[model samples]
Target chain A: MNALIVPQWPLPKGVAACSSTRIGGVSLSPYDSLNLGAHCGDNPEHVEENRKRLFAAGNLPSKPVWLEQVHGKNVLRLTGEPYASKRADASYSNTPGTVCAVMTADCLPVLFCNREGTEVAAAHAGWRGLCEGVLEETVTCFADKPENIIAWLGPAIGPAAFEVGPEVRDAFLAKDAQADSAFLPHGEKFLADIYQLARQRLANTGVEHVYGGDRCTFSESETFFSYRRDKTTGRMASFIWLI
Target chain B: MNALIVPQWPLPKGVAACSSTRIGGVSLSPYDSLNLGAHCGDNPEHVEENRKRLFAAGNLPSKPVWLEQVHGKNVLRLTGEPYASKRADASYSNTPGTVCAVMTADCLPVLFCNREGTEVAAAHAGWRGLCEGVLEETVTCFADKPENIIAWLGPAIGPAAFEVGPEVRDAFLAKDAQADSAFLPHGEKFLADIYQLARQRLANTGVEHVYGGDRCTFSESETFFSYRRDKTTGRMASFIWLI
Candidate 1:
């Protein structure tokens, strides 16, 4: 599997970032290759091995503070307290070498870093998290106002494959009519663009320097994990940290 | 899907409990039916439909305070809020109608309630969480002493299919040497029993009123989602609440 780093976003010298994938480590078939979620019944050894390799492969600054993502807007501060993926979807850290991480199979993993890299954050955004304001909630973690925060939207289940019912469109648009343009009519359902939705959300928070929403988790199965495409799946990790 | 309650654990008059299965509701092939995970790429509509049907079918007391479990010991107090399924493995509530809920496919879903029925909680315990003492931490959420609290181990991947490396036994055994009994040599690795692990952990906390550790998610595919058995799968929710 390819060892990849997060798409480059211009920021301070000390920041480091990347999104993990279904490659680069050992897990059994189907979850075949790299799988990081020990909860998904992957052999714990392989999950650990995957976690180790991703960090080494990224040439990472430090091991991350893993967030237990429930698609909630709950964000927390990173205390550099070992690898406990706690009950939150977003996290921020101001201390150097303190990493913030989020895991995903198809849901968008968003990483945040300020111009100084003194504070870094990451979030997991499924549609529910997006509608509930996970991005904006995460933005508040930084001492910097939203204007200076750099946001990166990692690979996710793409718009083409992400069809939703009326309830979803109503929920999405209901959050803000600005989200209406992000959805297009499809049969009895709607096609939701997670990237545009995130952009609008970030824009609402005065975040103009958004980057990296190019990859699609569903179609790019060779590069990422897609829970929608394959019934059984593994997760990828995206993270950011100070030097 | 069959609307299944947990193996009846005799308890206070006001305590309500059940564990969900993959047998009920409208999901397509692969997921087949009854998939509760919106994060797993199932149609959100189908998941919600399944949720409504399960409660009505089971004659449950209230919609649970859904936890977005990540195999951690982190738990929260339920406030009777809407279902966020936040990032916690366990949740407890002293308030009536604030259901404590955990979701899993092959991982164990453990339910807790006192004999008085004044409080209830539920947790998702994979091997890591179990070794990390997720259950013992959950036991502390109660006002009652461990002996007065009734615990039930919900269905999960059974020992027959739960193959793991030496590291699993080591991690668990390191927690307490008595945990050695939970594993048996199987080739280079060991076959770990999550139920045994949980029971032993609970026993450490002096929780002797344990019940219901018989069902198996891996073998009982007709009723549960086993990530170990099938690469792609749905999840079952085990929940508890006061009347």
Candidate 2:
């Protein structure tokens, strides 16, 4: 494997973050190398193996607080261990080694950290999560001012190819009059800039100082997996920790 | 005293990217620090100083191809050098050292790259750009398959606080029927999810690997200066490059 690091973000001292790419582990074709999710159907043992490699390679303090992502805005704030009962789009943490993580094939994975480095979080910013206020809910987890916390946007789909219907654009425009600019008419549909939409949402909450958001999982097949590209695809992990 | 980092994305190998933050700067008061635009009532030298700091902190190979963002989809494809005669929403480059950058406060900034890492681009994905084909026009820059190139969403505003009129939603709905989910009733107005809007647009063109739509400029006054939050505020930047 070459380099598994895509979202090498800037957090304050002692806070660490990383996103898993496609090159680092082993699975098989379709769910090719590094298929992290047990739900993605590569192989349970292979998923386990890939996860083990992740913990070791990332030098994480412990296993990440992995939530069964349900494409909703619900987030599980962790003061202790990962729970199987909580199914949500994001997780918040103040505890060290309590890794906040999200697994994605093409959906956006967002990581959050305060400039103070005392609080950190991770969110699965898929379209539903974006529309449903996943990032918004995660922002409130920190007691620090919105300006003090910075978000690190991990890899997902890119705008150049993300085509959508007017209804989707309407959903965004309804919340932000200014958001009409994030989409462009492409035949019967429109091209959307997901990064811009995420920024708009983050700014709404005042949690600026966002970083990353500069990779495409679908475009880089050798390095990152994309569910949209191959229906049967592997998943990557974006993780944040306070070490 | 703080840190700044360009997003070193996972392209084929050598593509580069970055987004400006309100950290690691020497500006003061309102601008607070790291004010990059001279148009923000900041001292010209101070803005220049901020740019210098950005280059150094980001360790960019060269100054990015900056453009006056008019919310238009006009793209500058750099085959030779960065041009100033164009008022464009985006710019593309196959040339190394020709950094593609966009400036914004509340508006969205987007970055782009392909699997090869040999090409890069950046766009200002303000609402007008979305309504127009700015992202789509920029997509034409690459000779690669539309599926091969991907876009990265930088920081902007969050959806929850982004309120829009019915006409704004109508405009998007004019382009896509599926955009309905991106909007919700908000008292007299409506709530828009710019992130979802962008995703819908990107998915249209088969550029499914989108990333980095997870920050809000308006709310994060300490980390980023927002036009909506501060009215007269400094602007941040989004950048892309080929290493």
Candidate 3:
């Protein structure tokens, strides 16, 4: 892999986490190098090779628990055994070696772990998922207290770049007036800060030790895949697991 | 200079703006290089040389109207002639060739200009100044409508790294409860997002065309000086002018 973005937070012992960039692997053109999503119309062979490269380079404990990611608020609880429902926006696991992962392109990817490293989760929160309580659902799956869980916000579209319509603003505003701070008027639309919104949502659930809300996938085309920037694009994966 | 962060906004014709970094000059030790502020206890000779380098390298239209920023809500309207008071947090100028500048370390240095490019301004907004409306004061100085003015948020402390007491959060909350989104709990205190706060404040004043605010002064040590990280650190300057 050309580049692997390791989360720079205080991970408890036996917890390992990292987010991938669109830099390494064999994918070509719009997908470029490391396009991880199988459903994104890239050659399946390229996607498979990229996934293999990610598995090897990341040195993950096991194959990641990939989800269909319907942009819904469901959290798939992973076990050592195979699970039934694959259509979830987030995955959580208390089982060691069961990698919790989520893919994203412009939407927020949040990785969570308990203070004791006994549980971990990853959620892909687009504005729809975010508005529909995706992060809150992921938090609900955590066996640890919300305050004991630390969330590291991975790359997403930044506020300055993510412009939304009145409905998007009104949806968030209806949920919490504080969400108003996250939206700035941009002509007829509003520029929303996904990172700030994610942080506020996490805080609402009592998860205070949030980190890594800085990178912008839209503006940073070189390092991330932004669906908003490019109608058809690759997806980067954020992973978390117990060692 | 080693780095000049030019604002990437839809700048009007004849308007030019850029921010300096703590690189490329002769200041030593903590100051390292390109330290702009003379009041930061650096040697006068080294400070003078650094200022000279900034002047020559920046290709500024005129000597920047330096201010004695007291973290207060005061705006100095610069004329072609000398000003009586240099003790202001921001400087505004409609006169061509007159450069408006503000120095900052950790605190936000905001650059501003009207849509017509006939007027320009810069404000230094620390937490106190932000709460006290330094940005609002700067916007008020513009003769143009707030919608016609564009503001670009230069480098400052990022949200994840900025921890604050309840008093700081309360001060902002006292002004607007919407400010709650900009803060996350940090033990007994809170981690404040200064960029979000600044944006909200600017948005409150109807200055919606805001940009920049992605860089973190405290975390980005090699590129910028941070007062919170280093007590006796140098200061970076953000400048805007009507050419």
Find the candidate with the highest TM-score and give its number.
Answer: 3
DockQ of each: 0.01, 0.06, 0.17
Tens-digit lDDT string for candidate 3 (A1-243): 445887756577899988899998789979998999898899999999999988888899789988988999999998645667799999888888889999999889999998789999999999999988999999999878898888888988877578899999999999988787677667899888787788789879988667677677887788998999998889899999999
TM-score of candidate 2 versus the correct structure, residues matched by position: 0.54
**Between candidates 1 and 2, the TM-score winner:** 2
Candidate 2 structure quality by residue, lDDT tens digits, B33-97: 78899787987878888899888767789877677778888998866653556677888888878
DockQ, Cα level, model 2? 0.06
lDDT of 1 by residue, B107-180 (tens): 88888988678988888888888888888888898889887777877888766567899988888778788676
**Across residues B128-243, which tens digit of lDDT does each residue of candidate 3 receive?**
99999999989998889997887888889877678889999999999988787677666899878787788789879987667676677887799999989999989899998888
True contacts preserved, each candidate? 0.00, 0.07, 0.03
What interface RMSD does each of the candidate structures achieve? 23.7, 10.8, 5.2
Query: What lDDT does each candidate get?
Result: 0.77, 0.76, 0.86
DockQ of 3: 0.17
State the lDDT at B122 in candidate 1: 86
Estimate, for each residue in A1-243, the C-alpha lDDT of model 2 and write its tens digit. 243563433447778877887776778888777788888678898889988987888888988888878899887988776355678889898888788899898788888888678999899987777977888999987889887777767777866556678889888888788677567567799867777788779978976455556566776677888877888878888898899
| lDDT tens readout by residue for model 1, A111-168 | 8888666788988999999999999999987899776677777888766567788898
TM-score of 3: 0.78
